[PDB]
Amino acid sequence: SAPGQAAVASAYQRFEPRAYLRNNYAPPRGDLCNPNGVGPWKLRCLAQTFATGEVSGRTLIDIGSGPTVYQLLSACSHFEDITMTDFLEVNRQELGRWLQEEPGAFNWSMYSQHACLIEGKGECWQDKERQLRARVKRVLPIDVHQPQPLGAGSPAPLPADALVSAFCLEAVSPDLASFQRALDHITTLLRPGGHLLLIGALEESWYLAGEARLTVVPVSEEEVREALVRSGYKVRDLRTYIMPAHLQTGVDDVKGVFFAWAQKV
């Protein structure tokens, strides 16, 4: 078990946040004007799920935030305490730049505007970002391969009412078995009856983050569903987006994207 993990940790030492941001969150993949694009689909899954009112509580943990905040734009009106996490210091620093409203931070304002647009409440994007910054109460190291991903007696309020995780588990797991165990490990962080929102890449074997070319376990929708069931979830929603050819740039070999809403039993 330890070998595959050592390979993952080593490969991530070359991960370049800015290149990763450019590849995935600037145009063309970061084009929010095309409703058929992947950015709008992700934001829609999240906004629609939170719009049900069924996913709420006091505390939320984002698992493997990397250098991004988009996955929390709709969530942040429903949780007063948000923990963001990442394995890499360089990503935690990138989140820090953004938290401090630095220029030189990545500009999420197009995503914030798009979230305001689809949430349909007339909120301005500046109020949305102010609220996300207020509700993020800590940014913590994490390793999903450890039985306690946050370490012993972490700062984070546990158990959490909800988890969010985008493009983390399949990107740090050498094989399906590692992915299943990682899912079990983060599932310990979640209250029974709590909710997990999982976004990830389907049938991907690599992606680029600068010099770093990371190896990814290719997973199918069926594999994700079965993993959720095995970890003790009821699957409420599991959607697939098929990556259009024009978005099939050379930054990865992804075939689609999945969104799962699961409730822990």
Ligand X SMILES: Nc1ncnc2c1ncn2[C@@H]1O[C@@H](CSCCNC[C@@H]2Cc3ccc([N+](=O)[O-])cc3CN2)[C@@H](O)[C@H]1O
Could you list the residues known to form a binding site, using ranges: 20, 25, 64-65, 70, 86, 91, 143-144, 166, 204, 252
Q: How far apart (Å, rounded) are the C-alpha atoms in residues 43 and 54?
A: 17
Which of the choices its own copies, ligand X, none does residue 101 contact, using the CB cut-off of 5 to 8 A by kind? none
Can residue 257 be called a binding residue for ligand X (CB under 6 A)?
yes
Q: How far apart are CA 77 and CA 56, in angstroms?
A: 9
**136 touches which of ligand X, its own copies, none (CB within 5 to 8 A by kind)?**
none
- Structure token pair of residue 132: 């996300």
Residue 94 touching ligand X (CB under 6 A): no
CB environment 55-74: b (16+ within 10 A), e (fewer): bebebbbbbbbbbbbbbbbb
Q: Do 20 and 210 touch, CB atoms closer than 8 A?
A: yes
Angle at which helices 221-231 and 176-187 cross, to 10°: 40
Report if residue 197 touches ligand X, rule: CB under 6 A: no
**CB atoms closer than 10 angstroms to residue 27:** 13
Residues in 52-111 at the binding interface with its own copies, rule: CB under 8 A: none
State which of positions 139-158 bind ligand X (CB under 6 A): 142-145
Decide whether 123 or 221 has the Cβ nearer to its own copies.
Answer: 123
Q: Does 233 bind ligand X (CB under 6 A)?
A: no
From candidates 88, 136, 189, 224, binder to ligand X by CB under 6 A: 88
DSSP conformational letter for 152: T
If contact means CB under 5 to 8 A according to the sort of partner, which of its own copies, ligand X, none does residue 127 touch? its own copies
Which of these segments, 86-94, 98-106, 118-126, 218-226, binds ligand X (CB under 6 A)? 86-94
d(CA 203, CA 218): 4
With CB under 5 to 8 Å by kind, the binding choice for 142 among its own copies, ligand X, none is ligand X
Interactions with ligand X, residue window 210-229 (CB under 6 A) = 216
| Binding partner selected for residue 118 from ligand X, its own copies, none, CB under the kind-specific 5 to 8 Å limit | its own copies
Site residues (CB under 6 A) for ligand X, limited to 162-191: 167-168, 171-172
Give the Cα separation of 265 and 263 in Å (integer). Answer: 6
User: Of 24-63, which residues contact its own copies (CB under 8 A)?
Assistant: 32-33, 35
Q: Which residue, 224, 160, 167, is CA-closest to 201?
A: 167
Helices (H) and strands (E) in the chain, counts: 9, 9
What is the closest distance, in whole angstroms, from the C-beta atom of residue 196 to ligand X in the complex? Answer: 15
Does 6 interact with its own copies (rule: CB under 8 A)? no
* Secondary structure percentages of the chain, helix, strand, coil, to 5: 40, 25, 35
C-alpha to C-alpha distance for 28 and 39, rounded to whole angstroms: 10
Q: Which of 44, 49, 62, 66 binds ligand X (CB under 6 A)?
A: 66
Residues that bind its own copies (CB under 8 A): 32-33, 35, 113-114, 116-118, 120, 122-127
